[PDB]
């Protein structure tokens, strides 16, 4: 038990709704991680205050959504400066190989520098989409 709220943030057309699509403008489901149960609610300023974890999604095929991550992250951390926020940077569209603008290594480097987790996903194909919402659950538990 325990209720976990997870927020999806990022520029338009990076895949927020599609990612929430694979889980379920909110989606509520009872899931199981490392052999225990939890209700996870995925949301696609009162947002800032109630969120347990934040998924900052960019498209790996869109370099303008990558560059905007640092500022999105800092505005967010500024919203609760006393809090240690669990944050995952989600490199979506990992399937469009020939359209890529952002490598795995720059994305990983971005994450470490900024103290978040990193994961690449394809929401169109449900690749790493289960691990994404699972990693979210794990970070939130650590904060409890
Ligand atoms: N190839 C590919 N297309 C995707 C992926 N995720 C989303 N899209 C497409 O990109 C467009 C925008 O997705 P959407 O969820 O509306 O983005 P939003 O603006 O964050 O809500 C739609 O055409 C999606 O089908 C992905 O992982 N791979
Ligand atoms: Mg949308």
UniProtKB/Swiss-Prot annotation:
Query: Which residues of the sequence carry a binding annotation for GTP?
Result: 10-17, 92-95, 123-124
Q: Where in the cell is it found?
A: Cell membrane
**Where, by tissue, is this protein expressed?**
Expressed in brain and kidney.
Function of the molecule? Binds GTP saturably and exhibits a low intrinsic rate of GTP hydrolysis.
The family classification in the record reads: Belongs to the small GTPase superfamily. RGK family.
Protein name stated in the entry: GTP-binding protein REM 2
- The organism named in the record is Rattus norvegicus (Rat)
């Amino acid at each position: 038990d325990g209720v976990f709220k997870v927020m999806l943030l990022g520029e338009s057309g990076v895949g927020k709704s599609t990612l929430a699509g694979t889980f379920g403008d909110t989606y509520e489901r009872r899931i199981m991680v490392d052999k225990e149960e939890v209700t996870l609610i995925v949301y696609d300023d009162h947002c800032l205050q109630t969120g347990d974890a934040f998924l900052i999604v960019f498209s790996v095929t869109d370099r303008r959504s990558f560059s905007k991550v640092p500022e999105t992250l800092l505005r967010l951390r500024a919203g609760r400066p006393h809090h240690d926020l669990p944050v995952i940077l989600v490199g979506n569209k990992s399937d469009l190989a020939r359209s890529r603008e952002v490598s795995l290594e720059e994305g990983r480097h971005l994450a470490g520098t900024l103290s978040c987790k990193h994961i690449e996903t394809s929401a169109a194909l449900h690749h790493n989409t289960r691990e994404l919402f699972e990693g979210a659950v794990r970070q939130i538990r650590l904060r409890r």
